[PDB]
Amino acid sequence: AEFVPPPECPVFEPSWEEFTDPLSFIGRIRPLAEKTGICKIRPPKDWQPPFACEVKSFRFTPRVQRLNELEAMTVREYTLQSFGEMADNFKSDYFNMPVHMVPTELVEKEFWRLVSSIEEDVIVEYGADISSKDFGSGFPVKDGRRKILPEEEEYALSGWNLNNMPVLEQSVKVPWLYVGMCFSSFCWHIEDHWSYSINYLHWGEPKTWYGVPSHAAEQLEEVMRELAPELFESQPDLLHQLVTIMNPNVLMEHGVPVYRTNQCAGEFVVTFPRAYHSGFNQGYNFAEAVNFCT
Ligand SMILES: O=C(O)CCNc1cc(N2CCCN(C(=O)CO)CC2)nc(-c2ccccn2)n1
Numbered sequence: 001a002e003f004v005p006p007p008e009c010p011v012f013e014p015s016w017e018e019f020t021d022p023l024s025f026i027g028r029i030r031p032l033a034e035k036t037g038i039c040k041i042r043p044p045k046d047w048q049p050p051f052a053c054e055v056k057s058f059r060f061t062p063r064v065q066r067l068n069e070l071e072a073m074t075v076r077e078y079t080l081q082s083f084g085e086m087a088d089n090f091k092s093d094y095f096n097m098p099v100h101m102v103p104t105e106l107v108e109k110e111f112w113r114l115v116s117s118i119e120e121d122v123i124v125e126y127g128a129d130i131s132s133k134d135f136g137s138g139f140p141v142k143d144g145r146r147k148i149l150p151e152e153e154e155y156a157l158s159g160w161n162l163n164n165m166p167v168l169e170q171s172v173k174v175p176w177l178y179v180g181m182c183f184s185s186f187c188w189h190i191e192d193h194w195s196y197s198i199n200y201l202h203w204g205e206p207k208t209w210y211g212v213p214s215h216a217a218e219q220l221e222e223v224m225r226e227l228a229p230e231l232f233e234s235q236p237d238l239l240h241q242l243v244t245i246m247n248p249n250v251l252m253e254h255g256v257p258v259y260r261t262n263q264c265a266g267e268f269v270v271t272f273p274r275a276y277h278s279g280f281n282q283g284y285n286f287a288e289a290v291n292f293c294t
């Protein structure tokens with residue numbers, strides 16, 4: 001009856017030698033991680049980049065998300081502080097306990113119950129698709145728009161700085177920010193041009209991920225087309241991906257391999273080419289993501 005968590009995706013804790021270059025490291029872990037779609041990377045313990053966003057002027061209007069909008073078939077400005085105050089108040093009121101005491105398995109189980117619930121309409125807000133050009137990237141950048149301390153220059157030049165990832169494909173982009181709260185989510189989808197993606201959680205409560213390897217991409221799309229609303233069945237992928245929310249247990253019951261992970265603060269998540277992925281936030285957090293080429 002209740003949610004059965006998918007198996008855990010691979011977690012890598014590279015040494016300082018293996019942490020020298022991201023593309024080299026991702027290429028060596030590819031034989032395993034591409035069989036799970038997503039993977040988690042924990043940097044060395046002393047690798048702690050400072051949060052470099054202009055928090056004094058950071059303002060945004062988040063988007064409203066109704067969890068059961070598909071089942072039921074049916075805009076305030078915040079600062080970073082005011083959104084976090086709303087986010088913590090929502091979670092502590094909903095679970096009747098401090099936000100840091102709510103188990104991740106409980107938020108996960110309750111999230112998927114609310115998505116399919118008809119008698120309970122839960123509505124959250126998500127600060128999504130905030131460009132790193134608006135208020136700066138979460139990573140220090142030698143832009144000249146903000147001071148970089150000597151202890152922060154190694155992070156401004158690091159290859160794991162998402163602003164330093166290669167983004168140009170060989171033929172004949174900047175990171176985006178996401179301010180999450182409890183139950184704010186993103187549905188199943190693949191990146192444009194089947195591109196890689198790397199995600200870094202700067203701070204806050206964990207972000208729960210679900211991933212499907214690329215070898216099962218067609219199987220997921222077939223299951224989606226079979227069970228998604230018939231009114232959205234003939235929609236193109238770029239538009240259907242806006243409303244492709246589906247319980248992972250439903251995919252697993254149809255033979256789709258699904259892996260999960262809890263991305264905690266200071267940890268990376270890499271999605272491989274054509275790896276369908278979805279997830280939700282356990283609470284107030286801040287993430288940065290960019291597509292990169294190999
Ligand atoms: O929350 C994170 O830390 C990043 C999760 N990853 C996203 C998030 C995203 N936002 C936020 C969630 C709502 N939402 C969807 O649910 C449909 O995707 C769309 C807007 N949009 C994308 C995306 C879109 C088009 C092509 C590639 N990617 N990826």
Ligand SMILES: [Mn+2]
Nearest residue numbers: 189190191197
């Ligand atoms: Mn995406």
